[PDB]
Design a protein around this ligand. Structure first.
Ligand SMILES: OC[C@H]1O[C@@H](O[C@H]2[C@H](O)[C@@H](O)[C@H](O)O[C@@H]2CO)[C@H](O)[C@@H](O)[C@H]1O
Length: 138
């Protein structure tokens, strides 16, 4: 498959209408997954499913600027399942990232980092087997 952590360059940054698709399988005793859209050392959008935060499943989203995390946005709808295959799609819209999992809308994250053309790498990490990571324009 692909080695994790995996770094997917996004040449020239992100732009509205760009669709990123990630296919993989959650490992059986997974603890976390993370997608990190980076602008240099900053993390424009961190998407972090947590399988056991105080015995609860939660998705945490945030931005890291100058090595400091901002205000978390938390989602209790949790579509990932230990041991099972998933598809994550991230659609860049003008004002938000829009995330769908297994073809169902999950969340939207308003752009905090506004220089979209400078968000030029995606890091994929955590307790997954990674099958495919790619992008296209819709
Ligand atoms: O916000 C994303 C960021 O969270 C860090 O963990 C936070 C944690 O979510 C919060 O409840 C606690 O009070 O502070 C921790 C440290 O900032 C993670 O360490 C980091 O990897 C990101 O996931």
């Amino acid at each position: 498959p692909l080695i994790v952590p995996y770094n997917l360059p996004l040449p020239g940054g992100v732009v509205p209408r760009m669709l990123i698709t990630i296919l993989g399988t959650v490992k059986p005793n997974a603890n976390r997954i993370a997608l990190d859209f980076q602008r240099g050392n900053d993390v424009a959008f961190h998407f972090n499913p947590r399988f056991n935060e105080n015995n609860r499943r939660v998705i945490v989203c945030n931005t890291k600027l100058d090595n400091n995390w901002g205000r978390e946005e938390r989602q209790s709808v949790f579509p990932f399942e230990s041991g099972k295959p998933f598809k994550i799609q991230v659609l860049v819209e003008p004002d938000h990232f829009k995330v769908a999992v297994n073809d169902a809308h999950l969340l939207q994250y308003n752009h905090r980092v506004k220089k979209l053309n400078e968000i030029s790498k995606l890091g994929i990490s955590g307790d997954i087997d990674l099958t495919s990571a790619s992008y296209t324009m819709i």
